[PDB]
Scaffold this active site. Structure first.
Site, PDB file in Angstrom:
ATOM      1  N   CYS A   1       1.179  -1.119  -0.045  1.00  0.00           N
ATOM      2  CA  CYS A   1       0.149  -0.047   0.125  1.00  0.00           C
ATOM      3  C   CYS A   1       1.107   1.021   0.006  1.00  0.00           C
ATOM      4  O   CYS A   1       2.034   1.075   0.609  1.00  0.00           O
ATOM      5  CB  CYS A   1      -0.894   0.036   1.340  1.00  0.00           C
ATOM      6  SG  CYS A   1      -1.965  -1.519   1.435  1.00  0.00           S
TER       7      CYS A   1
ATOM      8  N   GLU B   1       0.871  -3.599  -5.950  1.00  0.00           N
ATOM      9  CA  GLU B   1      -0.274  -4.304  -5.505  1.00  0.00           C
ATOM     10  C   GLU B   1      -1.472  -3.666  -6.046  1.00  0.00           C
ATOM     11  O   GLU B   1      -1.677  -2.438  -5.673  1.00  0.00           O
ATOM     12  CB  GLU B   1      -0.349  -4.755  -4.246  1.00  0.00           C
ATOM     13  CG  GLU B   1      -0.981  -6.034  -3.816  1.00  0.00           C
ATOM     14  CD  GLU B   1      -0.939  -6.421  -2.487  1.00  0.00           C
ATOM     15  OE1 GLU B   1      -0.010  -6.162  -1.607  1.00  0.00           O
ATOM     16  OE2 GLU B   1      -2.089  -6.807  -1.970  1.00  0.00           O
TER      17      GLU B   1
END
Ligand SMILES: O=C(NNS(=O)(=O)c1ccccc1)c1cc(-c2ccccc2)ccc1F
Ligand SMILES: [Zn+2]
Length: 272
Positions: A140, A174
């Site tokens: 993140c 991601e």
């Protein structure tokens, strides 16, 4: 009833999403965070008392980057669990899709600060899996609202690929990305690819670009597509651009803000 507003440093910031702080903590008008150790508190008075006592004046872990007053700390989730969990609960206030807050030991966190006489003030971070089976070089990434769109997100994304380069590997964030995340990555990739296309001329293949930038072939290809710089020939994407077109793209307002750059001379890091 959910946390909807925090106080951190000199900032008051509205929440964008639910974050699972304990329920008791949501009941309050604000949540008060120490900007240095990230302890979250229920009252202005426990906050002020904490401020007089707390000895932290920067993140924990290793300062792996320092240039003038810009610093990055690498914080292993196994060694600084409570700090990392506090950081993940803070981040989830601004990230729709993050889902890991407590199990932080498989992650390393890279905390970006801007330093003055008082100490090192948190701007944002990205997390990364120690072992990513999918080649994700960021898990993140989150920039606190008052620092967004000010070049700090750009610095961290460049930072994450500087790690990937030192690991001799390609990497990609991601998915899914946040709205600002996607714009930021697309614009970062375009800048870097354009600048490399300017600096060579040059018989650079897509594989060449991938090796030099640690950007994946897929992220290179989708970026070159949105710039209309790729043709297709018997099943293969092939670079197709003139020196003039490259400069037309680079002269655009998109690339005009002076970046905070990552100076590889100031980065201290070898793959674990
Ligand atoms: O602040 C950001 N981008 N704007 S920027 O001025 O740093 C920039 C980024 C890339 C290319 C040019 C400018 C940013 C913000 C986020 C982010 C994402 C979700 C929630 C909070 C912050 C992630 C990556 C980012 F790069
Ligand atoms: Zn503290």
């Amino acid at each position: 009833k959910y946390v909807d507003k925090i106080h951190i440093g000199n900032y008051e910031i509205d929440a964008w999403y639910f974050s699972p702080f304990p329920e008791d903590y949501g009941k309050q008008p604000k949540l008060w965070l120490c900007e240095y150790c990230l302890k979250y508190m229920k009252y202005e008075k426990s906050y002020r008392f904490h401020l007089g006592q707390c000895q932290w004046r920067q993140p924990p872990g290793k300062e792996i980057y320092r240039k003038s007053n810009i610093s990055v700390h690498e914080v292993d989730g196994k060694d600084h669990k409570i700090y990392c969990q506090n950081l993940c609960l803070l981040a989830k206030l601004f990230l729709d899709h993050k889902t890991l807050y407590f199990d932080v030991e498989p992650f390393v966190f890279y905390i970006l600060t801007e330093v003055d006489r008082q100490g090192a003030h948190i701007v944002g971070y990205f997390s990364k899996e120690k072992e990513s089976p999918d080649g994700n070089n960021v898990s993140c990434i989150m920039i606190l609202p008052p620092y967004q769109r000010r070049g700090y997100g750009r610095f961290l994304i460049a930072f994450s690929y500087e790690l990937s380069k030192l690991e001799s590997t390609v990497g990609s964030p991601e998915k899914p990305l946040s709205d600002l995340g996607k714009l930021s990555y697309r614009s970062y990739w375009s800048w870097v690819l354009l600048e490399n296309l300017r600096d060579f001329r040059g018989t650079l293949s897509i594989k060449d670009l991938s090796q030099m930038t640690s950007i994946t072939q897929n992220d290179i290809i989708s970026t070159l597509q949105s710039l209309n710089m790729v043709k297709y020939w018997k099943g293969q994407h092939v670079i197709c651009v003139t020196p003039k077109l490259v400069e037309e793209h680079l002269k655009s307002a998109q690339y005009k803000k002076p970046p905070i750059t990552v100076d590889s001379v100031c980065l201290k890091w070898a793959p674990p």
